Amino acid sequence: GAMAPSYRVKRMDIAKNDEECVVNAANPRGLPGDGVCKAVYKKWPESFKNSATPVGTAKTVMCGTYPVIHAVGPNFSNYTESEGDRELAAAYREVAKEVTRLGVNSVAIPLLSTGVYSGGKDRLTQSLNHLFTAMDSTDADVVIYCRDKEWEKKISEAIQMRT
Numbered sequence: 001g002a003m004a005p006s007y008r009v010k011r012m013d014i015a016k017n018d019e020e021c022v023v024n025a026a027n028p029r030g031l032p033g034d035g036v037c038k039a040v041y042k043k044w045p046e047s048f049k050n051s052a053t054p055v056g057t058a059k060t061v062m063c064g065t066y067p068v069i070h071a072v073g074p075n076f077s078n079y080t081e082s083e084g085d086r087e088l089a090a091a092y093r094e095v096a097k098e099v100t101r102l103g104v105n106s107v108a109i110p111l112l113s114t115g116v117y118s119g120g121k122d123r124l125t126q127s128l129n130h131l132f133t134a135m136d137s138t139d140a141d142v143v144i145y146c147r148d149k150e151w152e153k154k155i156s157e158a159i160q161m162r163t
């Protein structure tokens with residue numbers, strides 16, 4: 001575990017992370033995808049061997065010894081707000097199981113269902129709060145990766161609000 005498990009946020013490409021494993025914002029089919037998923041495919045293409053897994057689940061595939069945790073958030077275009085909320089909570093609970101199983105001391109994690117799967121809504125708070133609910137009981141250092149300058153500020157404020 002980490003010395004003093006922390007949350008941090010960085011505004012940069014998760015494919016450049018400095019952590020012991022990465023969480024992909026995957027699609028259920030293990031396809032290269034777009035956004036975070038395509039960055040992950042370019043950097044760790046070997047990790048897409050038999051990476052297909054259902055919505056609300058996570059499936060780890062090793063790229064060398066580097067673990068890629070393929071987490072499948074719901075596409076809110078297709079799910080109801082209620083069912084999508086359940087599946088998004090579930091995906092992060094499966095990430096926490098994988099992070100624990102792997103024995104890593106740090107993980108790089110994107111905000112699931114906030115991009116193309118957001119159904120055109122701002123889900124920063126929804127996605128981050130489900131991230132915290134899952135990861136709070138883990139002792140890995142968590143580094144959240146985002147693209148937008150205003151999102152960085154809001155995620156940082158949310159982390160600091162808990163102290």
Ligand SMILES: OCc1ccc2c(c1)CCO2
Nearest residue numbers: 011012013014146147148
């Ligand atoms: O698409 C690659 C990429 C990802 C995050 C990010 C940047 C680029 C600039 C600021 O943060």
Ligand SMILES: OCc1ccc2c(c1)CCO2
Nearest residue numbers: 013014035036039145146
């Ligand atoms: O612009 C697409 C994109 C790619 C990688 C990545 C992000 C976005 C946020 C953190 O990591």
Ligand SMILES: [Cl-]
Nearest residue numbers: 114115116117
């Ligand atoms: Cl997304």
Ligand SMILES: [Cl-]
Nearest residue numbers: 146147148151
């Ligand atoms: Cl972002």
